[model samples]
Target: VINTFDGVADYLIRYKRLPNDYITKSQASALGWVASKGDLAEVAPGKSIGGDVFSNREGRLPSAGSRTWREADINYVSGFRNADRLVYSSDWLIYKTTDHYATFTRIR
Candidate 1:
C-alpha cells in the first residue's frame, strides 16, 4: 500500500506512525546499505523504507517537545538519490518534502 511518497505520508497520518516493517539506517547498513556505494537491493530487499534520526538542523520543523524527531526516506530505490522524505516526531508529528531538506509541508 505504501509504494510511493504520498502513500507513506498518508499511512503515517492515518496511523500516527510508520508501518511495522520500516527499517532504520543501522538496520539498512547491517543489510548492506553503504551510503557512499548506493546499493541496497540484494541486502535490503522488499523496498527498504524509512528509518533514521532527522536532526532537524535547519530548524524548519517545530520542536518535538518531549518527543524526539525521526525520519523516513521516501520513494527510495536501491541505488538512487532522492531528496523526498517523511519526517516525524515520536508523538506522530509528520512532514513531507521533495527538495531534500529545502522545504516541508505538514501532513499531520
Candidate 2:
C-alpha cells in the first residue's frame, strides 16, 4: 500500500517525528540531487519525501502558538511526485493537502 494520509499522520503524531527515509531538501541536493535535472530516484535513491518547511504565509492555518510547519509527500513513488502532502506544525497539528496545497484538511 502507499503511504496514505493515516500512515503519515499517525507516524508524525505518534512519534512526533519523521521517518529515516526522509531527508531535507538541502541534504538531497548535496547528494547529487542538485537541480541538475536529476531526479531523486536516480540521484538519491531510497528517499521518499519529507523535511520541507511549509510556510503558511497567508495564515490559512489557525494559530496554535507555534509557527513552524513541515511537510511530507504521500503515496510517494520512486520516480514521480504527487500532490498529496501531510503538513504538520511544531505543536503537532497535522493537515493533509490533496490538491497541491490549494486546500488543506485537518487530520489531527
Highest TM-score: give the candidate number.
2
Positional deviation of residue 99's Cα in model 2 after best superposition, in angstroms: 1.2
Quality of model 1 by C-alpha lDDT:
0.74
Kindly report which residue stretches of model 1 are placed more than 4 angstroms away from their true locations once superposed: 14-16
Off by over 4 Å in 2: 35-38
TM-score for every candidate vs. truth?
0.81, 0.85
What would the per-residue lDDT of candidate 1 be over residues 36-90, giving only the tens digit for each residue?
A: 7767666766655576778888789988457678777777656764787888888
How many Å off is the CA of 60 in candidate 1?
0.6
User: lDDT winner among the candidates?
Assistant: 2
True lDDT of residue 73, candidate 2: 81
Candidate 2 residue pairs in clash (backbone atoms < 3 Å): none
TM-score of 2: 0.85
